[PDB]
Design a protein around this ligand. Structure first.
Ligand code: CLR
Ligand code: CLR
Ligand code: CLR
Ligand code: CLR
Ligand code: CLR
Ligand code: CLR
Ligand code: CLR
Ligand code: CLR
Ligand code: CLR
Ligand code: CLR
Ligand code: CLR
Ligand code: CLR
Ligand code: CLR
Ligand code: CLR
Ligand code: CLR
Ligand code: CLR
Ligand code: 2BV
Lengths: 683, 675
């Protein structure tokens, strides 16, 4: 047995920020025996290890890298520890043509093939949580995300990859923050911004501050859901910390039901790897070589990965032996290219599962998704990302059975008048129209007898046919949504605008000229009467035509403030009221209302003047004055009230149509019943 | 003669950019060592510098540093290092070999920390050394409001984060904070929204042209604004695009560039025995092959610091060097304390270290129309600023203040116009008193007895009270006080409606009795009831919601003076509670009474001979008094903002309305009673 040596240089962190080498150092050495005993692969070479402590500090890793690179046994690969040491070693190893194979460096900045040309690692990067988060966002339909963040650079690059990953899946970030040591003002801005999907990214000693500050500002609850990182200790809120005025029994309600995601190192199944070994017996064999307990030593969870790292190198030296390796110097670029092409395509089954690298040097692996459920975590799913396989396990216990949504939804309800107060007033209007047509036919039937032929024919008939249309103009005053739809609101609107104006103008013009002419003949001929009536009606349809030309009417929605349903617990409901309007609706009927009020107040004074000093026995009226009295006292009291109470739902329609049915009943009762009480009752 | 080896790391190739630095100081260091061998500074030994090329790259620099440790002789301290990353990599790791480093071009602030890099010293001031300079500029000009505009690179974010911590504890606020990456001028539009005129820019050479052309499109220059930017740009950097050159030269005038000073000016003998001017002429005669670089005096002082430190360490050691391996560390502590105790005078000023930083000098320069020129200096040792008087200028006359000054400038009315209208209404008052005297002199007469002269006394008293109101109208602003104004307007609306009501009630009662006598085919209670109604509405006005003073303000629009302050024109009004209730009711009641009286006067249109001789011109006067009162109230609603005008037109309307109706009643009296 010749058994020549091939050397491997390594830096194991024994202390510092991440003391992994307390457990990764035996797990490599044990693994080395499993390559030096099995005679199938590397049949003549023997791998030996030269290691140094590095303390996760580049100020000593530089000296130890000098000691590795400038001594007698020529190394063939380098194996650094923490992220910073691996950054220095991987950027420095280009000038010596060395492969760098890390086992614990999780920065996203080490996936830059331009800077680091010969890098490989088996610990996956921290941009492996982001496809898991994107899959957990598409599954529950969320579409708005707030991200709080401690401003260390690894979290900055994690979120700057999360944005680029999430903008191609139709989701958009709405809110970003940052802090250094005091998280008070970003959770204040999160409270006042009112976002409900939070992706927190910070270490443990900041999490214990920010979560009881969340409890103090009451940001948790039924409608909130967080997202954290998973490699915290499993009782990270139940420990004592004097740096907060928060209680241990408190904040356990505040971290309630938050999803965490983490990388899974150890294989959850119980199959056989390429070393003919399972997970539980690997842990059992490793626990012998440690001088302490697994809960107290550092870097116990990462200890499988280093194992597979060694095995990966062994396979990369079996697919090339066929240039020998006892001649590798630091200047020839060839053998490193052979090893690089051999390790670019690697796919096998180790203790951590299926090991296969990416095109940027990282390692693609599974992800575990768990949730807090009453003080302790519970595994609620697994996710593979290289072929998109989710595995759910039906344990996501929410509060209301369903996961909450991101923002509250608006409901644009409508508000319609109750149909009973529409239908009663419409049937009173039909009784009015049949009374009007029967009185018109009665007055037109006796067109020869010299009791109404001599007094005033062709004028009370015109009053009655005006009041006919004025009574018929209350059907299109109550058709908004319950009985009509849309896209014919101009038809109903122009109908109600022409009909009511034409009816009122015609009727009051006739009853006004019947007082005006007896006043102007008492104080010292039907063509002038018809001229006055046609002139008033023509001026009124002229100004209605000017309304038709300049600013036509259309539908317009106004809205009130939002309310609460109190059958659900979170819906926002806003009411909508639509009506006919224009751009200048207050003035363009204000002119008409003022003009008609002036005409009405002119008429009532002459009706009082020619009361009983008529002595004009060719007209025989005596009660048209009362017919102007009641219309003048009834229209002037409901003309400003139905423009004041336009915000009310149905009182405007009630007052308007009530005024219209009273002012058209009484002007036909008091005008026509003495015309029949003296003729076909005194017959 | 045993040598003393010093490792030197500098970019010495032509293929990199910053290598133009590395050749440019190579004469000056060559100028220094020849002096130290001439005087025999290191009598026991002699100095020897060994150069190495790092090529401004992490891998190449680390390989060259490793090769210099392996193959070269026993070095004692490291000198040089230019690029920031390579100096970071080496300076973190010196402590393992017990070497002390001295730089001359590492200007990054990251090396200020003494937990990471404890064996590091540099002689160039850092990039934070401009931050206690700009502060001591502001206290020289008493500016206190500033607004920062930062680029989003680490190299400038460190400077801004230090400026925030150094402005604390002083009377200077940071009213606005900005940032930009590629889009400069939406940020400067947001800065214009807060209207700040002192900007502390921090950005590289590319974005400066974009910021200044986007300021030219925003017109952020002149004698209002001030720019304070870094000054390590290339000379004539504006020449290299889309923007117009002369517009840029007119927008870029008057900024202040802050930098570190290349060479001192206080012409004293230095420790070598020369002047700064003699050294400058010597190095200029030496540098004949290549262009200059602004770091050479710092290299000269670095070599002298190294020599004095080795001398002090040798004198300390001989009271207990050629045997120095890197395994020793007591010699490292000795050399560290010897370099910590450095205090002397060199060609860049008083060379002295505080916590590992050079306490050096800062130079302010200002841009004048073709070039930048030195306009001051700031010695940071004694903490004093020296401004050369006759070089710094601005566009205007004063140093421009931060925020403009607001001024009230109430809108008053013209004393000639007010005096003219008071003269017109006082002659109208004389005319009304003359008519009352005539009608009270000619009382017993068979034309006056049949014309109801007591109603004419009422209409003269109404015209008198209507005339008297214009004096109380418009005593506004700069005329009386701030307490009479809450009573003057309520006594004015007390008197004016009574003066209207008496006269119009007299005319309306005359026309009403004409109509009542005509229809059938004593007085003085009508005006009594109308006065009762209006006194009731006036005491209901006064008792519940009285009129008080209320000011309206505009939006500080014009600048007409030229003294560069803003004025905020403001008006006074007597209106406080609802003003669409207790004016609409009064106006509607008066309008309805007017229109009823006008229609009653038209209904007769002069058919009555016997009882009242003048019903014709009385109805003519009603007609009169209606329409012009309507147009007066309408024009008062129209121009409710401008002052000289609406007062003048209300005064003209009221003097016409009160002088025509006093003519039409009493002018036939004179013609018939003189004839
Ligand atoms: C017989 C006719 C002439 C009488 C008409 C009365 C008119 C002049 C009244 C009735 C409604 C009033 C309008 C009510 C609302 C507004 C909106 C306001 O922003 C400007 C004034 C304006 C536009 C008013 C002007 C005067 C007005 C149009
Ligand atoms: C604001 C209100 C009071 C103003 C109303 C204006 C009134 C008075 C105007 C407008 C139209 C006018 C009428 C036009 C036509 C005629 C017919 C003629 O054979 C008798 C006069 C008579 C009847 C006019 C009387 C005055 C009249 C009615
Ligand atoms: C704002 C409104 C009320 C003001 C309206 C002014 C009215 C009242 C004026 C304007 C035109 C006037 C009319 C002019 C012409 C005539 C014809 C004459 O044979 C009878 C009087 C009569 C009919 C006048 C009555 C009053 C009159 C109608
Ligand atoms: C717009 C204007 C024209 C409408 C005015 C309405 C007028 C005509 C009403 C309102 C009050 C009424 C008066 C009420 C009291 C009296 C006293 C009585 O002994 C004679 C009638 C007389 C004088 C009435 C005549 C008509 C009258 C004056
Ligand atoms: C808004 C309010 C003030 C307007 C009210 C209009 C009033 C004044 C009108 C409407 C009906 C009119 C009445 C109609 C009938 C009569 C009966 C008669 O034998 C005496 C006059 C008298 C009593 C009238 C007086 C004035 C009157 C009461
Ligand atoms: C003879 C008299 C009674 C007729 C008077 C006509 C009155 C009722 C008319 C003319 C102008 C109209 C006003 C025009 C403008 C507005 C402002 C609006 O925000 C509320 C309605 C309101 C206040 C209207 C109410 C009715 C109104 C006051
Ligand atoms: C304040 C001032 C303007 C008011 C002056 C009132 C003037 C216009 C009045 C007062 C006396 C009046 C004069 C009385 C006597 C006569 C003589 C007669 O043969 C012609 C008219 C004439 C000349 C009158 C014209 C108008 C008159 C001059
Ligand atoms: C003799 C009677 C008719 C005189 C009554 C005077 C009335 C009209 C006065 C006295 C108090 C006044 C009210 C004072 C306070 C308010 C509350 C404000 O938000 C709306 C206006 C309103 C409601 C005023 C309207 C006019 C008002 C009600
Ligand atoms: C003889 C009697 C009947 C006449 C009374 C005139 C009444 C109707 C007048 C005088 C003061 C007016 C009020 C003035 C102020 C307001 C406050 C406003 O927010 C709603 C309208 C309201 C409430 C008005 C309604 C009509 C009103 C009450
Ligand atoms: C002869 C008399 C009775 C006629 C009086 C006409 C009255 C009723 C008219 C003229 C001015 C009108 C007011 C105009 C302005 C406003 C202010 C608004 O916020 C409420 C309605 C209110 C208060 C109107 C109510 C009706 C009103 C008071
Ligand atoms: C006989 C006629 C002249 C009397 C008319 C009364 C008029 C002047 C009254 C009745 C309603 C009143 C209006 C009520 C509402 C508004 C809207 C407000 O934003 C501006 C004032 C304005 C526009 C008022 C001005 C005066 C007004 C138009
Ligand atoms: C807003 C309200 C207060 C305004 C009301 C205007 C009132 C005061 C006006 C309108 C009609 C006027 C009346 C017209 C007719 C007569 C009949 C006469 O023989 C006595 C005076 C008397 C009774 C008048 C008194 C004043 C009067 C009632
Ligand atoms: C500032 C200006 C516009 C105000 C002018 C007021 C005008 C409109 C007043 C003053 C004198 C008035 C005139 C007095 C006399 C007559 C003669 C009569 O047979 C027809 C009306 C007529 C012609 C009046 C019309 C209106 C009139 C001309
Ligand atoms: C404020 C303004 C609108 C009010 C104007 C009042 C007007 C309408 C009054 C004042 C004088 C009146 C005129 C008096 C004389 C005549 C001559 C007669 O043969 C026809 C009617 C006519 C032409 C009258 C019509 C109405 C009239 C013009
Ligand atoms: C027959 C038609 C043309 C007569 C209409 C009379 C109009 C011109 C009168 C009635 C009410 C008046 C308005 C009353 C209130 C205001 C609000 C004020 O801030 C500006 C002027 C303004 C807007 C007035 C302008 C003139 C006005 C609109
Ligand atoms: C300062 C100036 C404008 C004031 C002038 C006052 C004028 C308007 C007064 C003074 C004398 C008056 C005139 C007196 C006599 C007559 C003759 C009569 O058959 C028609 C009216 C007429 C013609 C009067 C009209 C008004 C009159 C001309
Ligand atoms: C899950 C994670 N794995 C290794 C980590 O990604 C290595 P890293 O990315 O280089 C960060 C270290 C360095 C400083 C001190 C601890 C953290 C981790 C994080 C924190 C701790 Cl304390 C451990 Cl033991 C492991």
């Amino acid at each position: 047995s010749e058994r020549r040596a091939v050397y491997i240089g390594a830096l194991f962190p024994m202390s510092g920020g991440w003391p992994g080498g307390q457990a990764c150092q035996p797990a490599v050495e044990m693994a080395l025996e499993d390559v030096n005993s099995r005679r199938d692969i590397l049949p003549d070479y023997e791998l030996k290890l030269i290691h140094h402590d590095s303390k996760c500090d580049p100020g000593q890793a530089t000296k130890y890298l000098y000691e590795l690179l400038y001594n007698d046994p020529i190394k063939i690969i380098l194996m650094p520890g923490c992220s910073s040491v691996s950054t220095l070693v991987a950027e420095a190893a280009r000038m010596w043509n060395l492969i760098v194979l890390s086992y614990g460096s999780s920065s996203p900045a080490l996936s830059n093939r331009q800077r680091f040309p010969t890098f490989f690692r088996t610990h996956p990067s921290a941009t492996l949580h982001n496809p898991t988060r994107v899959k957990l966002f598409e599954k529950w339909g969320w579409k708005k995300i707030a991200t709080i963040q401690q401003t260390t650079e690894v979290f900055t690059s994690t979120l700057d990859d999360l944005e680029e990953r999430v903008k191609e899946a139709g989701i958009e970030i709405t809110f970003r923050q940052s802090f250094f040591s005091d998280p008070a003002v970003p959770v204040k801005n999160l409270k006042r911004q009112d976002a409900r999907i939070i992706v927190g990214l910070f270490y443990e000693t900041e999490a214990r501050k920010v979560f009881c500050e969340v409890y103090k500002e009451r940001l948790f609850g039924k409608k909130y859901v967080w997202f954290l990182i998973g490699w915290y200790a499993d009782n990270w809120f139940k420990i004592y910390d004097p740096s907060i005025n928060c209680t241990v029994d408190e904040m356990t309600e505040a971290v309630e039901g938050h999803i965490t995601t983490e990388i899974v190192m150890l294989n959850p199944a119980n199959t056989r790897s390429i070393s003919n070994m399972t997970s539980q017996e690997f842990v059992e064999k490793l626990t012998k070589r440690l001088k302490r307990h697994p809960e107290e030593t550092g870097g116990f969870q990462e200890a499988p990965l280093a194992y597979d790292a060694i095995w990966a190198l062994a396979l990369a030296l079996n697919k090339t032996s066929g240039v020998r390796l006892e001649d590798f110097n630091y200047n020839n670029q060839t053998i490193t290219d052979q090893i690089y092409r051999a390790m670019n395509s690697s796919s096998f089954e180790g203790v951590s599962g299926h090991v296969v690298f990416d095109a940027s040097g990282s390692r693609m692996a599974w992800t575990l998704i768990e949730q807090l459920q009453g003080g302790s975590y519970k595994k609620i799913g697994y996710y593979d990302s290289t072929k998109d396989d989710l595995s759910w396990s039906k344990t996501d216990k929410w509060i209301g059975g369903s996961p909450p949504a991101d923002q509250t939804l608006v409901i644009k309800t409508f508000r319609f008048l109750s149909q009973k107060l529409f239908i009663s007033v419409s049937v009173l209007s039909s009784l009015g129209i049949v009374l009007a047509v029967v009185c018109l036919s009665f007055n037109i039937y006796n067109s020869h007898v010299r009791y109404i032929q001599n007094s005033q024919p062709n004028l009370n008939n015109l009053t009655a046919v005006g009041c006919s249309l004025a009574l018929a103009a209350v059907f299109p005053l109550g058709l908004d949504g319950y009985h009509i739809g849309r896209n014919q609101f101009p038809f109903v609107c122009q109908a109600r605008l022409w009909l009511l104006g034409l009816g009122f103008s015609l009727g009051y013009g006739s009853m006004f000229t019947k007082i005006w002419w007896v006043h102007t003949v008492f104080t010292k001929e039907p063509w002038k009467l018809y001229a006055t009536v046609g002139l008033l009606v023509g001026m009124d349809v002229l100004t209605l035509a000017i309304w038709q030309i300049v600013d036509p009417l259309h539908r317009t929605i106004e809205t009130f403030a939002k309310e609460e349903p109190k059958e659900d617990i979170d819906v926002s409901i806003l009411p909508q009221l639509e009506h006919c309007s224009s751009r200048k609706m207050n003035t363009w009927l204000g002119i008409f209302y003022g003009y008609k009020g002036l005409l009405l107040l002119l008429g009532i004074f002459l009706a009082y003047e020619t009361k009983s000093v008529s002595t004009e026995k060719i007209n025989d009226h005596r009660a048209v004055g009362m017919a102007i009295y009641n219309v003048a006292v009834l229209c002037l009291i409901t003309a400003p009230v139905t423009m004041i109470l336009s915000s009310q739902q149905d009182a405007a329609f009630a007052f308007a149509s009530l005024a219209i049915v009273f002012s058209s009943y009484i002007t036909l009762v008091v005008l026509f019943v003495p015309k029949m009480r003296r003729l076909i009752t005194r017959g | 003669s045993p040598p003393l080896s010093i490792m030197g790391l500098m970019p010495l190739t032509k293929e990199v950019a910053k290598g133009s630095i590395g050749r440019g100081v190579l004469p000056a260091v060559e100028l220094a060592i020849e002096q130290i061998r001439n005087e025999s500074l290191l009598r026991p030994y002699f100095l020897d510098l060994r150069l190495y090329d790092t090529e401004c790259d992490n891998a190449k620099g680390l390989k060259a540093f490793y090769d210099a440790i392996k193959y070269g002789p026993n070095h004692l301290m490291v000198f040089g290092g230019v690029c920031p990353s390579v100096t970071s990599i080496i300076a973190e790791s010196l402590q393992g070999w017990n070497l002390v480093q001295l730089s001359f071009a590492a200007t990054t602030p990251v090396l200020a920390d003494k937990k990471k890099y404890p064996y590091f010293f540099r002689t160039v001031p850092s990039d934070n050394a401009v931050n206690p300079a700009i502060l001591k500029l502001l206290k020289h000009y008493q500016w206190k409001r500033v607004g920062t505009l930062t680029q989003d690179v680490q190299r400038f974010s460190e400077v801004r984060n230090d400026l925030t911590g150094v402005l604390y504890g002083e009377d200077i606020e940071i009213s606005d904070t900005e940032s930009f990456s590629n889009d400069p001028c939406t940020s400067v539009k947001k800065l214009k929204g807060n209207d700040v005129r002192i900007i502390l820019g921090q950005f590289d050479q590319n974005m400066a042209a974009k910021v200044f052309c986007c300021a030219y499109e925003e017109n952020m220059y002149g004698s209002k604004y001030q720019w304070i930017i870094p000054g390590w740009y290339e000379p004539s950097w504006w020449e290299q695009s889309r923007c117009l050159r002369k517009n840029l030269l007119a927008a870029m005038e008057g900024y202040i560039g802050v930098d570190f000073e290349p060479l001192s000016s206080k012409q004293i003998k230095t420790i070598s025995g020369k002047t700064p001017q003699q050294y400058e002429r010597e190095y200029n005669n030496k540098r004949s092959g290549v262009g200059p670089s602004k770091f050479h005096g710092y290299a000269y002082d670095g070599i002298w610091v190294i020599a004095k430190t080795l001398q002090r360490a040798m004198e300390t050691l001989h009271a207990s060097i050629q045997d120095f391996n890197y395994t020793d560390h007591t010699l490292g502590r000795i050399i560290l304390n010897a370099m910590n105790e450095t205090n002397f005078f060199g060609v860049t000023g008083q060379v002295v270290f505080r916590n590992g930083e050079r306490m050096g000098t800062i130079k302010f320069t200002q841009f004048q129309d073709s070039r930048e020129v030195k306009v001051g200096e700031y010695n940071a040792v004694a903490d004093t600023l020296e401004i050369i008087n006759d070089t710094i200028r601005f566009q205007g006359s004063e140093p421009p203040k931060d925020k403009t000054i607001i001024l009230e400038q109430l809108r008053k009315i013209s004393l000639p116009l007010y005096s003219i209208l008071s003269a017109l209404t006082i002659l109208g008052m004389i005319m009304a008193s003359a008519f009352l005297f005539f009608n009270i002199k000619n009382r017993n007469q068979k034309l006056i007895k049949m014309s109801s002269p007591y109603m004419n006394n009422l209409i003269i008293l109404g015209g008198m009270l209507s005339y008297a109101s214009i004096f109380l109208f418009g005593l506004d602003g700069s005329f009386v006080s701030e307490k009479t104004f809450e009573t003057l307007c309520t006594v004015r609306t007390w008197i004016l409606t009574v003066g209207y009501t008496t006269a119009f009630g007299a005319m309306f009662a005359k026309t009403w009795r004409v109509h009542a006598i005509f229809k059938n085919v004593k007085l003085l209670v009508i005006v009594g009831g109308m006065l009762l109604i209006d006194l009731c509405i006036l005491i209901c006005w006064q008792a519940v919601d009285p009129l008080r003073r209320t000011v309206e303000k505009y939006s500080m629009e014009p600048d007409p003076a030229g003294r560069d302050i803003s004025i905020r024109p403001l008006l006074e009004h007597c209106e406080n509670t609802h003003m669409t209730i207790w004016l609409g009711i009064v106006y509607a009641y008066k309008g309805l009474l007017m229109l009823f009286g006008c229609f009653l006067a038209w209904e007769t249109r002069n058919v009555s001979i016997p009882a009242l001789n003048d019903s014709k011109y009385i109805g003519m006067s009603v007609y009169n008094v209606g329409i012009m009162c309507i147009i007066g109230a309408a024009v008062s609603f129209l121009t409710r903002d401008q002052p000289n005008v609406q007062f003048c037109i209300v005064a003209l309307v009221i003097i016409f309305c009160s002088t025509i109706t006093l003519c039409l009643v009493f002018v036939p009296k004179l013609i018939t009673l003189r004839t």
